[PDB]
Design a binder for these strands. Structure first.
Lengths: 157, 140, 331, 205, 28, 84, 146, 23
RNA sequence: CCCAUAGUAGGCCUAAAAGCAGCCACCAAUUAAGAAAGCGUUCAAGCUCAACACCUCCCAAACAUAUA
């Protein structure tokens, strides 16, 4: 027969025999792994600087505000000096640990936003939360004193 | 819906660029043209100005006026009604720092343009980038 | 409103298979005939169900008989038809009624053990362009009264027409030529307001209206303060804008038999010089300048004429409207 | 020119003397034209053979049929048909040597890159066309990007280094352990039990 | 067409190991 | 259907499920899907509430407490109450 | 677990939450079977393992709901496929030929009516393909095509 | 810096866009 | 899963070609969003995605679980 034809070339039973002897067995696992078990640092430094500089920091769970609502809130917090920002919660937890704040650790959960200022201007945010029926102010920190939603409402009143 | 109109201050009701863009929502074309003409008369003329145009399902219009385009203002300040064909190898015009600062201040004065940054350096950089996108070379 | 592309099937041959005798049918031709608005009176313009076919041939076997003949197919249109083929160009160039164009393919037979050949029925690729919904597409301005203008200038009441398109059917209006015959024009789909006047009853419908080969620019021929619009967009300014858009859309279409409609002429009278203004806007280059010898800002100087709507006076306005309709149907 | 050049059936200068068709020029994994050459995607030959002007012309037709010259350029890295394969007279007495040359074809072994593709286009969009070409190809192949060949090489190295066998093909063969030298090929020390004739077995770890 | 099953694996493995051990003790 | 009380105050242990249910898929972000919502947040204490109390227009009323109930399950219960 | 009480008044109430065993000797595993020391020794005869992962109407549990590894969750799903057809799981009704470990589904299996030559033989489908490395206490090879 | 971070984010965005270009 | 504004309807050519008809730069304002990547658009408007908020009638019959 031809060396290479329409049919496949012939293999000797000795050849296929050693080929099976040449069964390339992959690695045999023992325990098996499947059933077995720069921006961040800069953001943390900026958060620490903002916490140190500002006297009043308020944490909100506001996510309901749209882009236009966020722009209106930014305009209101620009008219009266209050820096609004948001960072990662995992980064903020290391930031909270570095800043040595105990009561602010459980408050930072889910979608959140910090408002850091020297002059307290949370009354405008309180009025905005009064106009659109949401209550995002919860667990504030003004003058090294952790407050609640009722405390924030009393301070705004 | 939200539309984006760039109709000229002079001729409010044109043929090609007036109706076919956002007339399908349902509104009086003559009333919108009259409102645009009144807004253009309330402001300076000789330059196109963007409008917000608040449309409602009850056929109610609330036309808001911002300012002229920063590219159009830069072209007017440079003195070239036609831009560069290849930006920015062919420098069509040269814009000084004072005129660029004045244009940036004029753009930040408008509220519908939403140029409400705290620092003016950001607005100056934005105006410089808009000029560099066109055929304008910044001097000093 | 759009252009239609159909496949035409003709007669097919027959069979046998007798020792004496032979084949059957032949192959018919494809005819295109344009008819008046009375063809649109029967709703056959929303017909499209992937074209139509024709009859086939017969065999006969008792006792040695041959078969029948084939069948030709005629494709009618509701109002006007421009016929083209798969060659990339049109042979017949008309849109008036009673015009026919034919494409022939046939000469059929049968297979092999008495009198020979192999085949099936024949077909051709026809393209029907109605040159807008009926005869021309009307794009007005924000002073448009084209429906009332057509009703005032013609004794025939407008009806509802359709076309062989994949979209909605625009409304059509009848115009009088003062010659014992009537022509038709087409407006924006649904509620007619004018394409330039911020209305087409849809974005796809606006594209369909703008896809018309023959466009008519309706504008206020009266004064801007006397125009039926508040605020009016000025006769000169809106006319110049619409004419500039139409000319810059295609220089060939500007040089083609396109016209601009003179509307809002029911306030104007014989002495109001509406016809004089229409002539001054038609004979010029759609600007202030009348004639340009060498230096012309437009693609072509001395363009076509203007069409009259809401006719008045007796200085040949009806004759001008009839000539405009004839030029539009000439395509 | 972002298009595939036409491959002629034979060169202008012909081959006067008769020559044989050696299978060894397609046998073995090829070393030349094995990696990418100014390309980010190509077709690596997963087998040996010879490509004539017919296969090259079919590939060029399939490339120019579906390509964007402003975003995708393709250059055929293989040469034109050059090796003369002959055919004798029809209805001639059997045996008796060779007649005139019949047609030219260039032979390519396993691992050769066929057409280098580059530009503003990834291999994912051209994957369908490359798979149709590979199924229609003369020899077996595989459409591989610049990183796909590296991924395959790393996977092969990992498979080789993760072997658990108490006996390997070289471990009995190069040793000539149990008389497989009565069947072992003289060239078998080179393919290491991976290239068997005209078929190429890269799947053997 | 012919295939060799695990029986071939075990007996031939006895063969290969026999040859390998013979090689091993034959190296001094 | 109609306004929802949504009781939440910082008196007992805070619930992340209740906070997620109040802030997301009940608040003004969800007002686009349910146009006639008029959702409000209540700061009146109930006592281990995590209520998200909703008073429907048909007089249905819904209490899903809620401290151990997940935000997804409470939102699904609210969606099922809306669909009814 | 939660229920939706409906009568129009509809409410959602959390009632009858289930709990795990008190003594996991295989804590910090990744498969739940690895979390419960059942890495390869779960079989299709196991009623308890079947009940631990079967929905009340017989719905398939996702691995996040299941808490098992994806390979282990597929093992659980294949075991469910084994056991529901085994006639040993009547606890999940929606509204005869006896069996022993039929893998593929009944109502589309073609009648294997062309028995191939013994040198090219196709055999019948046999056993669940998922359990190729199941914990074998035997020395016989585990069959796949009978 | 923030400008460098914005440039890197824009580069990653362009890279993912060019990846989706084949899709 | 989620979120998607703005100089801006980026400029030349283009009736308009708005990120998406062809070219040049692709900057840049917010924690974070490509002068635009698959749609849709006459032009627009509306979808996502990237970046941020969350993480000739085949032919053996058969059987997986008993310690190479």
């Amino acid at each position: 027969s031809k060396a290479v034809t329409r049919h496949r070339r012939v293999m000797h039973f000795q050849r296929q025999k050693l080929m099976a002897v040449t069964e390339y067995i992959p690695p045999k696992p023992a325990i098996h792994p499947s059933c077995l078990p720069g921006l961040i640092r800069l953001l943390r430094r900026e958060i620490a600087a903002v916490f140190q500089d500002n006297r009043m920091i308020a944490v909100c769970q506001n996510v309901a505000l749209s882009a236009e609502d966020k722009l209106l809130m930014r305009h209101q917090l620009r008219k009266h000096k209050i820096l609004m920002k948001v960072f990662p919660n995992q980064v903020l937890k290391p930031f909270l640990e570095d800043s040595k704040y105990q009561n602010l650790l459980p408050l930072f959960v889910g979608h959140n936003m910090l408002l850091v200022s020297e002059e307290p201007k949370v009354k405008e945010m309180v009025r905005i939360l009064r106009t659109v029926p949401f209550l995002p102010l919860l667990g504030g920190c003004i003058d090294d004193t952790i407050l609640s939603r009722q405390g924030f409402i009393n301070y705004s009143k | 819906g939200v539309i984006r109109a760039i109709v000229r201050a002079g001729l409010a009701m044109p043929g090609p660029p007036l109706g076919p863009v956002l007339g399908q929502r349902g509104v009086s074309i003559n009333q919108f043209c009259k409102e645009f003409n009144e807004r253009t008369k309330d402001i300076k003329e000789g330059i196109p100005l963007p409008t917000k145009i608040l449309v409602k399902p009850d056929r109610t219009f609330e036309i808001k006026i911002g300012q002229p385009t920063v590219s159009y203002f830069l072209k007017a300040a440079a003195g070239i009604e036609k831009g560069a064909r290849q930006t920015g190898k062919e420098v069509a015009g040269l814009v000084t720092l004072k005129h660029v600062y004045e244009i940036a201040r004029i753009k930040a004065q408008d509220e519908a343009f939403a140029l409400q940054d705290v620092p003016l350096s950001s607005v100056v950089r934005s105006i410089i980038g808009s000029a560099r996108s066109l055929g304008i070379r910044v001097v000093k | 409103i759009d252009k239609l592309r159909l496949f035409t099937r003709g007669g097919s041959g027959g069979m046998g298979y007798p020792r004496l005798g032979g084949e059957g049918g032949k192959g018919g031709d494809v005819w295109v005939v344009a008819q008046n608005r009375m063809t649109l009176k029967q709703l056959k313009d929303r017909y499209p169900r992937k074209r139509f076919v024709a009859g086939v041939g017969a065999n006969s076997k008792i006792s040695a008989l041959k078969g029948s003949k084939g069948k030709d197919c005629e494709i009618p249109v509701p109002v006007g038809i421009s016929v083209t083929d798969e060659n990339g160009k049109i042979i017949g160039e008309l849109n008036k009624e009673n015009d026919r164009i034919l494409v022939a393919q046939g000469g059929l037979g049968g297979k092999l053990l008495t009198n020979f050949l192999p085949l099936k029925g024949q077909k051709r690729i026809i393209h029907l362009d109605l040159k807008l919904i009926a005869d021309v597409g009307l794009v007005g301005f924000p002073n448009a009264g084209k429906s009332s203008l057509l009703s005032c200038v013609s004794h025939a009441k407008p009806a509802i027409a359709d076309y062989a398109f994949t979209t909605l059917k625009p409304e059509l209006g009848k115009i009088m030529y003062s010659d014992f015959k009537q022509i038709s024009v087409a407006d924006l789909p649904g509620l007619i307001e004018g394409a330039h006047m911020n209305k087409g009853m849809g974005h796809k419908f606006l594209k369909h209206i703008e896809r018309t080969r023959q466009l008519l620019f309706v504008v206020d021929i009266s004064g801007f303060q006397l125009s039926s619009h508040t605020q009016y967009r000025t006769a000169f300014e809106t006319i110049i804008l619409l004419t500039k858009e139409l000319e810059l859309y295609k220089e060939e279409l500007q040089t083609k038999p396109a016209l601009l409609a003179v509307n809002k002429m029911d306030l104007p009278d014989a002495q109001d010089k509406f016809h004089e203004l229409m002539s001054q806007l038609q004979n010029p280059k759609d600007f202030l300048h009348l004639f340009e010898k060498n230096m012309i800002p437009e693609r072509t100087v001395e363009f076509q004429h203007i069409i009259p709507i809401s006719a008045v006076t007796g200085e040949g306005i009806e004759e001008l409207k009839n000539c405009i309709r004839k030029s539009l149907d000439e395509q | 020119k972002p298009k595939l050049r036409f491959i002629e059936r034979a060169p202008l200068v012909p081959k006067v003397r008769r020559e044989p068709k050696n299978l060894s020029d397609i046998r073995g994994p090829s070393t030349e034209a094995t990696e990418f050459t100014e390309g980010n995607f190509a077709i690596l030959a997963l087998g040996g053979g010879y490509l004539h002007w017919g296969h090259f012309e079919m590939m060029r037709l399939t490339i120019n049929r579906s390509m964007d010259p402003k975003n995708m350029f393709a250059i055929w890295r293989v040469p034109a048909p050059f090796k003369p394969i002959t055919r004798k007279s029809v209805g001639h007495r059997m045996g008796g040597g060779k007649g005139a040359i019949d047609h030219y074809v260039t032979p390519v072994k396993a691992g050769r890159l066929v057409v280098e593709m580059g530009g503003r286009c990834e291999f994912e969009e051209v994957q369908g066309f490359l798979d149709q070409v590979a199924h229609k190809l003369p020899f077996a192949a595989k459409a591989v990007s610049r990183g796909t060949l590296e991924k395959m090489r790393k996977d092969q190295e990992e498979r080789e280094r993760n072997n658990q066998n108490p006996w390997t093909f070289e471990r009995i063969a190069t040793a000539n352990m149990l008389g497989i030298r009565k069947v072992l090929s003289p060239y078998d020390l080179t393919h290491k039990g991976k290239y068997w004739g005209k078929f190429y077995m890269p799947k053997r770890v | 067409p012919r295939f060799v099953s695990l029986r071939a694996k075990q007996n031939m493995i006895r063969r290969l190991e026999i040859e390998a051990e013979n090689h091993y003790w034959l190296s001094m | 259907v109609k306004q929802v009380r949504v009781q939440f105050c910082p008196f007992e242990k805070n619930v992340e499920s209740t906070r997620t249910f109040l802030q997301t898929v009940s608040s003004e972000k969800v007002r686009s899907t349910n146009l006639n919502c008029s959702v409000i947040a209540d700061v009146r204490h109930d006592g281990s509430e995590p209520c998200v109390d909703v008073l429907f227009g048909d007089g249905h009323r819904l209490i899903m407490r809620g401290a151990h109930l997940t935000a997804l399950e409470m939102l699904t219960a609210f969606a099922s109450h809306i669909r009814a | 677990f939660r229920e939706v009480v409906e009568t129009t008044i509809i409410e959602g109430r959390i009632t009858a939450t289930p709990k795990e065993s008190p003594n996991p000797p295989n804590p910090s595993g990744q498969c739940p079977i690895c979390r419960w020391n059942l890495k390869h020794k779960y079989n299709y005869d196991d009623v308890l393992l079947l009940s631990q992962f079967i929905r009340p109407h017989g719905g398939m549990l996702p691995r996040k709901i299941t808490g098992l590894c994806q390979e282990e969750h597929r093992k659980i799903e294949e075991c469910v496929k084994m056991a529901h057809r085994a006639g040993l799981l009547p606890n999940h009704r929606p509204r005869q030929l006896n069996r022993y470990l039929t893998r593929w589904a009944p109502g589309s299996v073609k009648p294997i009516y062309k028995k191939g030559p013994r040198w090219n033989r196709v055999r019948m489908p046999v056993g669940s393909p998922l359990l190729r490395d199941n914990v074998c206490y035997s020395r016989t090879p585990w069959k796949l095509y009978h | 810096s923030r400008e460098y971070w914005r440039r890197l984010r824009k580069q990653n965005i362009w890279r993912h866009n060019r990846l989706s270009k084949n899709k």
